[PDB]
Design a protein. Sequence first.
Length: 156
Amino acid sequence: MQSHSALTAFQTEQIQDSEHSGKMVAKRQFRIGDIAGEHTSFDKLPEGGRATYRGTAFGSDDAGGKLTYTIDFAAKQGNGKIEHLKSPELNVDLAAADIKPDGKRHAVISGSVLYNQAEKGSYSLGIFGGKAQEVAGSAEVKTVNGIRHIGLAAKQ
């Protein structure tokens, strides 16, 4: 009828200044901080979208893929779909998987992948070079047509 209301709120290691509340820095607080983008943006990735993760994911057979560049600087969801093989089934799409402050910069991203339909693959793409240079990685995509030991090489 005469009826309305609206509320919302959110923050993380992306929202400038709020960030101080977000990550660590200096605050009393309790037990609530970001623990998502802290080191992983800090590497030197700003709030923005698509960074340049250009690489190649050669198969144990080299029936491997290309690592297409798709990471939102916003948090560094370092993922890249593989879509360039003689068999459509071999197309490995990669899920968007984010990167907590693990071992600092967290030189791995625990991203699951699927062979068109078959989600029997785990990737481990990593970061180094601050802006993201040496996105050194591996996968172990495991199927009747899953050439596990993927040689992941990349440069930007």
